[PDB]
Amino acid sequence: MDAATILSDLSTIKTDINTLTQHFNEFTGDLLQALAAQAVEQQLESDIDQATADAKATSALSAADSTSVTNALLGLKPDIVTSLDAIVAKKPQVDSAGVGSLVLSDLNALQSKTDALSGALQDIATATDKDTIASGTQDIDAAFSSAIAVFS
Numbered sequence: 251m252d253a254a255t256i257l258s259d260l261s262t263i264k265t266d267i268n269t270l271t272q273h274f275n276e277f278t279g280d281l282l283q284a285l286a287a288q289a290v291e292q293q294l295e296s297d298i299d300q301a302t303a304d305a306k307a308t309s310a311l312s313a314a315d316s317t318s319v320t321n322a323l324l325g326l327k328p329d330i331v332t333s334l335d336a337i338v339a340k341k342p343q344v345d346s347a348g349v350g351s352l353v354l355s356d357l358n359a360l361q362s363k364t365d366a367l368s369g370a371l372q373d374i375a376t377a378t379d380k381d382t383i384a385s386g387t388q389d390i391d392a393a394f395s396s397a398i399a400v401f402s
């Protein structure tokens with residue numbers, strides 16, 4: 251509903267991602283581990299959708315708020331790349347657990363939901379910040395495409 255809400259929403263997303271990465275780095279193929287990570291992944295999906303809804307409810311951002319939201323979104327990029335790298339690194343464990351289709355389903359959902367979030371933030375950012383967001387989102391989308399290719 252306002253810029254502070256969107257920033258808080260983006261921080262929650264950041265926390266979710268870093269928690270997932272921790273799960274990935276511990277994954278041994280065990281299905282209970284997979285269940286635990288999927289719960290976090292589903293929380294992440296919900297949190298991204300919440301951010302999108304809050305952004306859709308928000309008026310054209312001041313210059314300072316636009317910078318804040320742009321930097322918070324772009325600040326997710328290395329966390330996303332790190333997280334995607336971490337699950338890719340565990341492809342053998344994913345294959346042995348037989349849960350590749352779940353990873354793939356999750357990746358496609360997350361890409362869709364993240365793209366929607368970026369679109370909504372572009373809509374309320376300054377003209378310059380929109381371009382910056384779009385550019386960073388291209389990079390996030392590239393990273394998703396690579397992970398999807400690995401898991402399909």
Ligand SMILES: CCCCC/C=C\C/C=C\C/C=C\C/C=C\CCCC(=O)O
Nearest residue numbers: 273274277283284287291330333353356
């Ligand atoms: C918005 C940025 C997205 C960052 C990447 C986040 C998730 C990658 C997608 C799916 C992986 C998560 C759960 C799938 C379930 C089991 C696979 C092993 C999980 C584990 O380790 O037990």
